[PDB]
Amino acid sequence: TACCFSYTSRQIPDYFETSSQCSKPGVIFLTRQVCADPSEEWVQKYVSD
Amino acid sequence: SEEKANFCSTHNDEVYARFRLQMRVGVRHSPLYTPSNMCMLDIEDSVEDIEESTEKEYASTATGEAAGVNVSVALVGEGVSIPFSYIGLGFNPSLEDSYLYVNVSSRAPWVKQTSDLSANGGWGIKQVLEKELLAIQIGCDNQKFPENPADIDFSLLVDPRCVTSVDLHVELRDACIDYKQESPLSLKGKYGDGELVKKEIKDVGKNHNMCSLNLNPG
Ligand SMILES: *[C@@H]1O[C@H](CO)[C@@H](O[C@@H]2O[C@H](CO)[C@@H](O[C@@H]3O[C@H](CO)[C@@H](O)[C@H](O)[C@@H]3O)[C@H](O)[C@H]2NC(C)=O)[C@H](O)[C@H]1NC(C)=O
Numbered sequence: 001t002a003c004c005f006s007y008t009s010r011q012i013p014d015y016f017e018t019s020s021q022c023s024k025p026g027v028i029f030l031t032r033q034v035c036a037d038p039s040e041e042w043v044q045k046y047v048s049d
Numbered sequence: 050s051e052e053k054a055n056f057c058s059t060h061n062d063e064v065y066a067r068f069r070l071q072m073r074v075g076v077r078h079s080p081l082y083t084p085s086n087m088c089m090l091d092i093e094d095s096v097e098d099i100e101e102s103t104e105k106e107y108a109s110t111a112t113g114e115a116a117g118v119n120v121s122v123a124l125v126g127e128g129v130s131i132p133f134s135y136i137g138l139g140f141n142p143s144l145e146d147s148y149l150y151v152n153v154s155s156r157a158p159w160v161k162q163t164s165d166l167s168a169n170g171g172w173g174i175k176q177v178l179e180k181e182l183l184a185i186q187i188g189c190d191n192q193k194f195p196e197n198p199a200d201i202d203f204s205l206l207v208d209p210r211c212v213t214s215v216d217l218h219v220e221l222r223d224a225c226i227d228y229k230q231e232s233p234l235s236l237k238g239k240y241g242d243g244e245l246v247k248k249e250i251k252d253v254g255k256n257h258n259m260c261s262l263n264l265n266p267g
């Protein structure tokens with residue numbers, strides 16, 4: 001049960017939605033397991049989705 | 050240091066990265082947690098391929114587990130290896146809410162020369178700067194519960210069931226910066242109160258268990 005405290009600034013190159021209450025929202029990305037925000041990279045999960 | 054300055058002086062023209070992370074994690078335990086003094090430490094280095102790029106991926110991954118909390122700290126470079134050599138844990142084994150302290154440090158060039166990143170008109174630096182990633186992950190492992198360009202790029206992921214807070218200071222800098230007015234390589238990263246944890250972590254050995262792993266030099 002993840003809760004993302006800091007995102008990666010650089011979007012690159014499955015998913016999760018931290019919005020289970022949590023401190024903040026986020027998209028954990030399996031790849032490591034790297035953390036994201038809501039800005040443009042929503043391509044990958046909403047564009048490649 | 051005795052070893053250090055005499056080395057640094059010998060390489061005025063070079064840049065060798067040095068990574069340091071001081072981190073304090075707010076801990077709390079489940080009702081069923083059973084106090085333990087155990088401490089598990091590892092540092093393992095991986096190479097993977099980006100097929101997109103000509104470049105290989107180099108991650109140095111430091112892990113530590115004490116007090117029911119398991120911590121992962123991976124430094125991921127692209128075409129460039131910054132390797133960890135030391136991880137330090139400071140923890141309280143009891144069931145009570147406490148703080149957990151983690152040191153991680155990369156290898157010292159005077160101990161075992163890392164790569165010189167100034168080479169090829171600074172080829173490595175552009176890499177570190179453009180694609181270096183820091184991934185820190187923290188979990189309550191095995192536990193069962195009742196149901197700008199100077200800024201380092203880190204993802205910080207944690208479990209709220211055992212992690213109450215996180216504060217950390219992290220730096221990725223020119224190793225011999227103490228002998229340079231400027232350096233093209235000087236990266237900083239804070240979460241919460243870094244300047245605090247940087248002091249505080251320097252004296253928790255009085256009231257904490259302390260374990261440490263240091264890799265062979267040579
Ligand atoms: C994180 O890294 C720092 C730097 O290596 C470590 O700081 C060192 O902390 C120890 C104890 O925490 C200090 O011990 C010294 O020796 C005796 C122990 O009997 C003590 O009585 C002295 O007063 C003195 O504190 C040592 O000076 C200190 N060194 C520095 C440069 O700050 C720290 O242990 C690491 N944190 C970990 C493993 O959690």
Ligand SMILES: *[C@@H]1O[C@H](CO)[C@@H](O[C@@H]2O[C@H](CO)[C@@H](O)[C@H](O)[C@H]2NC(C)=O)[C@H](O)[C@H]1NC(C)=O
Pocket residue numbers: 119120121186187188189190191
């Ligand atoms: C800390 O430890 C737990 C347990 O080892 C890790 O979580 C498990 O990871 C395995 C695969 O290694 C999954 O199949 C499980 O679903 C995960 N959860 C549990 C409760 O077992 C967790 O990844 C570790 N966290 C860190 C930061 O190392």
